[PDB]
Hints:
The structure holds 2 protein chains of 2 kinds.
Chain A (H helix, E strand, L loop, with lengths): L5 E2 L3
Chain B lengths: L8 E2 L1
Subcellular location (chain A): Secreted
Protein name (chain A): Microcin J25
Organism (chain A): Escherichia coli
Amino acid sequence: GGAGHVPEYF
Amino acid sequence: VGIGTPISFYG
Lengths: 10, 11
Protein backbone atom coordinates (compact mmCIF):
# COMPACT_ATOMS: atom_id res chain seq x y z
CA GLY A 1 0.00 0.00 0.00
CA GLY A 2 2.85 2.34 0.81
CA ALA A 3 5.35 2.74 3.60
CA GLY A 4 5.17 0.25 6.44
CA HIS A 5 6.60 -3.05 7.66
CA VAL A 6 4.57 -5.89 6.17
CA PRO A 7 4.97 -6.26 2.37
CA GLU A 8 1.66 -5.92 0.52
CA TYR A 9 2.76 -7.97 -2.47
CA PHE A 10 0.21 -9.13 -5.03
CA VAL B 1 1.83 -11.07 -9.50
CA GLY B 2 5.12 -9.41 -8.58
CA ILE B 3 5.84 -8.24 -12.11
CA GLY B 4 3.92 -5.11 -13.06
CA THR B 5 2.57 -4.91 -9.55
CA PRO B 6 2.78 -1.87 -7.20
CA ILE B 7 4.36 -3.88 -4.38
CA SER B 8 4.88 -1.94 -1.17
CA PHE B 9 4.53 -2.21 2.61
CA TYR B 10 1.99 -1.51 5.34
CA GLY B 11 1.68 -1.45 9.10
